[PDB]
Design a protein around this nucleic acid. Structure first.
Ligand code: HF4
Ligand code: HF4
Ligand code: MG
Ligand code: MG
Ligand code: MG
Ligand code: ZN
Ligand code: ZN
Lengths: 928, 73, 186, 188
RNA sequence: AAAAGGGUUGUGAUUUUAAUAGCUUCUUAGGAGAA
RNA sequence: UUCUCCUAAGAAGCUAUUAAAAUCACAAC
């Protein structure tokens, strides 16, 4: 039999019992992921291969195991070429065994190349399954997880088994892969060491390597003088990078012999600088990565190199003990007495940074030095007690008091008069469309520590370096139209000086006290001081007493006065210019009254073809945010400063922002904890940085959507060329191509138009391109969030709309409707009626319950009520009239009360206009 | 409008309990808070009424804190 | 702003000027009348503005004192208002279980613990007098919060354990009322 | 005010005009006297208006000076409070062990986080449930942070003292969790 | 009761001030008319 | 030389609007 003879030859001299998978001599059909760059296509995409025959090996018990034999049928010149290269490479242990033989297929002679003991799947399959997460790819991910003993098959019957938030145990499941990944890394370096010595020039791609780490596919390679060969590895490492942190390979480095069975390394407790160990790790794993790596970002040349080196540092820092990542302290003398003060920071991201203006001996302390020494946590933590808190997994530094504090939240007050009036009018009946949903929920003493423990979701994350470096330029294209720079202290504007100054300054007064005490010279001296030295600060957590639809507690972070002053002085000129602009993508500072909403909606609709609307939500947004994207947002904001600040000043400003906002010391209940990362509530820049992060996420989704598409099926030649140039710009080019950045920005603005405000976004997109795969959609956002943020975006929360006459389903908690006004049609926003009725019924202070004073309070609530009149639902319309009639009743009661008490009537009657409708109608007419 | 009345009465009852220094006992305060939030979230009336019965039993147990006979008259 | 001291002169000057123009009198007389009208009107407007200022100040004073007095009145009496409102709403609810527990508490039959929601959980109650026992209790069963319970243990003020049979009208003086009862939910 | 000399000159003109009107002098004399009187009135009004302007300017300057004095007083008070807090914290800390560890360091710098671990004399542990207590703090002495600690009396969530004999599996529902245990560092 | 109460934008009402604008007052010069 | 009329400048008083500060309240991420 011909098939049996072919199988017998395929078996060769090995003792491998082979199983004839496929059918006889026929080529097998498989669907697999490939990284590819040809003269006509360039992609990282799933393909149907149909190129080789495959057989399986069975154990001594004749059951099947994960070990395959693959034989390829191809041209004779390729046969000789691969034979020569393999004969060169034979000595390396990282190369799979190859055989070459000729066989009678057509009656004539055909050559075959065979390789042995391959796994079912390659590294590219694992990377694609994790990076492009969806249920179809889940079917492959399950097989990969089951085959290598990560988990048993029943595990996938759990609800939400994939969810990082609802099923944190999944993080334990992935870690088992990590060691198998690490062996893949070392093998790769070994392979390069052979390829250079043999004298070979070739590119490495993920698809060539199996899950045991062995390599094949020599056909692409060409020869060169021995000792001068080069590997090209950019795409391989860049694609692999997120998986490295997701699976946590370098955890194996933690142990003494690097054996997972040996005990942990016990470092010197006082050690704080690990530069040699970082260099050793980089040289071991990333030997042939051809770009200069700086362990300490202070040396870096520019913001892109800062991003590159911080991306490496975040991976490397996980190995080192948690106690070393903190501010460094030193002893100094003042007037003969010893102080302990801070002198530097050790960042997981930015390495070891030292201050430049330290004094070992001093005679006196000025006001600025007193502020600096009181602000930083060195004294409080050194004097305080030792704390071991079992309520949180987060690291805890010290306890400042002998007693811990438990803080409750009280319920809201009931405005019975308005409720009785509404019930008399006829609201709140069973079966009504309007009902109470927003309340003042109470909290027990455990609220603050639980909401802090919510920070546990933040995990280390290593981003795709090249993709991120392209996306940051695309975002800078979005932001480039504003102006910014530094200003002197006299120019800055403060909204409210009766707000808290943070810890410990709140002990002595509000911010007004510190703004009064310091002359402009002191503030400018402090701001100039921050440009040369790092100032750590303490942040306080507060519980917010406010109406909500959900019963979970909400905390907000107050930042110390020094950080607030210097951050205001640094960022305010750019932030005010962002607020001033109209018609931009970032829509902060635009009002909804006087026709603003219609203008915004008309702006977002501009010039798209075949349009649809869609919007999404980031779960756990502020807690989950990776540190790298916050650094990127800070650098994007710093880019405007290039005219006025040298590189060193900007690096020290970034270090200050990292020490104060990103990973500072958080004071909760009288105890100090370390914040693992993420956004803080009081940055003085929080909303704009959130907008930058939002735009970056959308652009990354678009890039993934365009690159994943099979380039053979795209009909438009222009889009094929754009995809080819996109792959070239990302993985196979070094310096920034400004022309292609402008071209991609124009493509995005034409086909995919956004409207952004913090973590809320609306986008109008070309449905035909979205269906073909040339622009992003909800699926790509889900995958991008899953691998980058480490959160699963519940699709039920997202929304999409097909009819533009109905507008967005939700923006800033407003619903949109189309109405006639004159002979024109306009868009109007209206709120959820439950919110308005609850704001009427429940108040946060007792005095508010009395209506007569609160007449002015009700008028504002009537304004938001006005659009509800346009609604076709009668129950919604009744609310506004209810508010007007309550205003009328309140005025009557006030007149009666004053007539009774003082016996003299009032002499001003402006309030008469308030209960009549026309005034409220003025609020939304575009006339002025 | 029974259910809305029940929820408003839960708000008023928890405010009355809070003014009565119930917070000093953390265990009892936690139970009261759980009852209050559960009544606010509830969707069908009989569950709200039973939870209200427990929450009112909390107030009634405090002998001499409120003159029930004087208040109800 | 009316009937002010300068109003009469202004009104009479305007009337005289209007009569003069109606007659067609001498131009110089008309101009003299018009200038007298203008000076009278200037004085009238000046004192009117002063009266406006006085009115505004009085209005502001009255409004501020009303606000302060009523804020103090609302703030001082919060506790009694809260309790009265609570019991008013409780009566308005008109539920059998709430009324049962409230009326029992009014008679002194208060519970010692939170009334449990679930089967076979433990409740403890105080019984002031044999009459309330006769009303609430029947043999081995107890009726409370519109629910049926099963008696577990009866105790006395001196912690003596009392058997259910002992509680009778004739024997009642012997016991040191009030009694404590423990029950489970059926 | 009537004491102004320009008002006095205006008053002399006013008396002249009133006498002329009472006597019934001719219109031409009345016109010339009227223009003289109106010159006097213009002088009086101009001086009064400039007096108003000067007085309000003086009031504004005085208010600015008063505000500055209050600001200086506040600055002095804040400086005193800051100095007192800093020196109290200086006196509180244990100099001997901190000096020993800082002298041991390679560069004189040490991480902040290790200072409470090494030097602190008193420890606090917050425990949410009985299993955690049994694991972490069973007994009157326990080892943490590579050191041996002996126990001082415990307080509950109500900050009332709990005896160590009470903390047991059967009794656990009665207590008001979490529990706060405090401890001192053993000499060895 | 103590304690503590963040960043950013928009909106309404009240009081104060400044600058334009309109009007009244009456002082000064020039032109015209009449004697 | 004297009277009447107009134009122009200065100084006061009233009023309409626009724009800046302070206080209270409302809404959104
Ligand atoms: N573990 C495993 C199992 C099966 N396979 C299969 O082997 C074949 C690999 O083909 P090749 O000759 O190595 O590469 P190529 O197609 O010439 O290269 P390309 O142009 O980069 O796509 C495919 O059919 C599957 O991917 C495998 O490589 N690794
Ligand atoms: N005072 C407040 C209030 C809000 N916010 C902001 O509102 C957002 C609240 O996050 P969210 O997406 O509404 O909720 P979440 O925590 O992501 O919850 P999830 O969607 O269930 O995962 C954050 O960007 C800030 O907390 C601010 O700044 N100050
Ligand atoms: Mg290949
Ligand atoms: Mg969100
Ligand atoms: Mg949304
Ligand atoms: Zn660098
Ligand atoms: Zn600058």
């Amino acid at each position: 039999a011909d098939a049996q003879s072919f199988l017998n030859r395929v078996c060769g001299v090995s003792a491998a019992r082979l199983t004839p998978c496929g059918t006889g001599t026929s080529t097998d059909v498989v669907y697999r992921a490939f990284d590819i760059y040809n003269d006509k296509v360039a992609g990282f995409a799933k393909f149907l291969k149909t190129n080789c025959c495959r057989f399986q090996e069975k154990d001594e018990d004749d059951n099947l195991i994960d070990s395959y034999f693959v034989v390829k049928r191809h041209t004779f010149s390729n046969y000789q070429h691969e034979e020569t290269i393999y004969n060169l490479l034979k000595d390396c242990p990282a190369v799979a065994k190859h055989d070459f033989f000729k066989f009678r297929i057509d009656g004539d002679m055909v050559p075959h190349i065979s390789r042995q003991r391959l796994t079912k799947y390659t590294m590219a399959d694992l990377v694609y399954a994790l990076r492009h997460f969806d249920e179809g790819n889940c079917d492959t991910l399950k097989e990969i997880l089951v085959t290598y003993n990560c988990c048993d098959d029943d595990y996938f019957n759990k609800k939400d088994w994939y969810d990082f938030v609802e099923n944190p145990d999944i993080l334990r499941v992935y870690a088992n892969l990590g060691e198998r990944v690490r062996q893949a890394l070392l093998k790769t370096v070994q392979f390069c060491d052979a390829m250079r010595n043999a004298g070979i020039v070739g590119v490495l791609t993920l698809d060539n390597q199996d899950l045991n780490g062995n390599w094949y596919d020599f056909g692409d390679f060409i020869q060169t003088t021995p000792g001068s060969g080069v590997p090209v590895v950019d795409s391989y490492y860049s694609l692999l990078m997120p998986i490295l942190t997701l699976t946590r390979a370098l955890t194996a480095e933690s142990h003494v012999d690097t054996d997972l069975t040996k005990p942990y390394i016990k470092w010197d407790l006082l050690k704080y600088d690990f530069t040699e160990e970082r260099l050793k790790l980089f040289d071991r794993y990333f030997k042939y990565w051809d770009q200069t790596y700086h362990p300490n970002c202070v040396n870096c040349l520019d913001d892109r190199c800062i991003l590159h080196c911080a991306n490496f540092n975040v991976l490397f820092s996980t190995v080192f003990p948690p106690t070393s990542f903190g501010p460094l302290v030193r002893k100094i003398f003042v007037d003969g007495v010893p102080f302990v003060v801070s002198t530097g920071y050790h960042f997981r991201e930015l390495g070891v940074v030292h201050n430049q203006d330290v004094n070992l001996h001093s005679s006196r302390l000025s006001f600025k030095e007193l502020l600096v020494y009181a602000a930083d946590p060195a004294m409080h933590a050194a004097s305080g007690n030792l704390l071991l808190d079992k309520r949180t997994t987060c690291f805890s530094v010290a306890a400042l008091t002998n007693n811990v504090a438990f803080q409750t939240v009280k319920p809201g007050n009931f405005n019975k008069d308005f409720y009785d009036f509404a019930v008399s009018k006829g609201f709140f009946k069973e079966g009504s469309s309007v009902e109470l949903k927003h309340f003042f929920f109470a909290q027990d003493g455990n609220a603050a520590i639980s909401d802090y423990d919510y920070y546990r979701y933040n995990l280390p994350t290593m981003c795709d370096i090249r993709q991120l470096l392209f996306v940051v330029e695309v975002v800078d294209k979005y932001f480039d139209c504003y102006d910014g720079g530094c200003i002197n202290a006299n120019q800055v504007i403060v909204n409210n000086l009766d707000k808290s100054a943070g810890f410990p300054f709140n002990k002595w007064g509000k911010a007004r006290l510190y703004y009064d005490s310091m002359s402009y010279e002191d503030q400018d001296a402090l701001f100039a001081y921050t440009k040369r030295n790092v100032i750590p600060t303490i942040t306080q957590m507060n519980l917010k007493y406010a109406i909500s639809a959900k019963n979970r507690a909400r905390t907000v972070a107050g930042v110390s006065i020094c950080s607030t002053m210097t951050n205001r002085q640094f960022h305010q000129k750019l932030l005010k210019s962002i607020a001033a602009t109209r018609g931009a993508t970032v829509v902060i500072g635009t009002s909804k009254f006087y026709g603003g909403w219609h203008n915004m909606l008309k702006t977002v609709y501009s010039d798209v073809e075949n349009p649809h609307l869609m919007g999404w939500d980031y779960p756990k947004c502020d807690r989950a945010m990776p540190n790298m994207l916050r650094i990127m947002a800070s650098l994007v904001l710093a880019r405007k400063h290039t005219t006025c600040c040298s590189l060193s000043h900007r690096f020290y400003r970034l270090a200050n922002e990292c020490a104060q906002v990103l990973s500072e010391m958080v004071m909760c209940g009288g105890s100090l904890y370390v914040k693992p990362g993420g956004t803080s509530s009081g940055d003085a820049t929080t909303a704009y940085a959130n907008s930058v992060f939002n735009i970056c996420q959308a652009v990354t989704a678009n890039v993934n959507a365009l690159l994943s598409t099979d380039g053979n099926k795209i009909a438009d030649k222009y889009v094929r060329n754009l995809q080819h140039r996109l792959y070239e710009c990302l993985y196979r080019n070094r310096d920034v191509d400004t022309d292609f950045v402008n071209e991609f920005y124009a493509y995005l603005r034409k086909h995919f138009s956004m409207m952004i405000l913090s973590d809320d976004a609306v986008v109008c997109f070309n449905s035909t391109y979205a269906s073909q795969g040339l622009v992003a959609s909800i699926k790509n956002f889900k995958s991008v969030l899953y691998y980058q943020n480490n959160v699963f975006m519940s699709e039920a929360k997202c929304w999409t709309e097909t009819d533009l006459t109905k507008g967005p389903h939700e923006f800033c908690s407003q619903h949109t409707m189309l109405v006639k006004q004159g002979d024109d049609y306009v868009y109007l926003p209206y709120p959820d009626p439950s919110r308005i009725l609850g704001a009427g019924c429940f108040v946060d202070d007792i005095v508010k319950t009395d209506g007569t004073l609160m007449i002015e309070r009700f008028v504002s609530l009537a304004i938001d009520a006005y659009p509800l009149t346009k609604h076709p639902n009668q129950e919604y319309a009744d609310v506004f009239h209810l508010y007007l009639q309550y205003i009328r009743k309140l005025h009557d009661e006030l007149t009666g009360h004053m007539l009774d008490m003082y016996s003299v009537m009032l002499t001003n009657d402006n309030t008469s206009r308030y209960w009549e409708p026309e005034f409220y109608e003025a609020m939304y007419t575009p006339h002025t | 409008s029974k259910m809305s009345d029940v929820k408003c009465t839960s708000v008023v009852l928890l405010s009355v309990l809070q003014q009565l220094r119930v917070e000093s006992s953390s265990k009892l305060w936690a139970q009261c808070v759980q009852l209050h939030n559960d009544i606010l979230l509830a969707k069908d009336t009989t569950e709200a009424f039973e939870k209200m019965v427990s929450l009112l039993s909390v107030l009634l147990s405090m002998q001499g804190a409120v003159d029930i006979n004087k208040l109800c008259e | 702003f009316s009937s002010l001291p300068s109003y009469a002169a202004f009104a009479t000057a305007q009337e005289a000027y209007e009569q003069a123009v109606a007659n067609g009198d001498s131009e110089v007389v008309l101009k003299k009348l018009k200038k007298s009208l203008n000076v009278a009107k200037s004085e009238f407007d000046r004192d009117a503005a002063m009266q406006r200022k006085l009115e505004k100040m009085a209005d502001q004073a009255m409004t501020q004192m009303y606000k302060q007095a009523r804020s103090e009145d609302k703030r001082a009496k919060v506790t009694s208002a809260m309790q009265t409102m609570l019991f008013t709403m409780l009566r308005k609810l008109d539920n059998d279980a709430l009324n049962n527990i409230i009326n029992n508490a009014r008679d002194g039959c208060v519970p010692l613990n939170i009334i449990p929601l679930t089967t076979a959980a433990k409740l403890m109650v105080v019984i002031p007098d044999y009459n309330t026992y006769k009303n609430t209790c029947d043999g081995t069963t107890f009726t409370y919060a519109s629910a049926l319970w099963e008696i577990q243990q009866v105790v006395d003020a001196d912690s003596k354990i009392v058997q259910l049979s002992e509680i009778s009208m004739d024997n009642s003086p012997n016991l040191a009322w009030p009694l404590i009862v423990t029950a489970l939910r059926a």
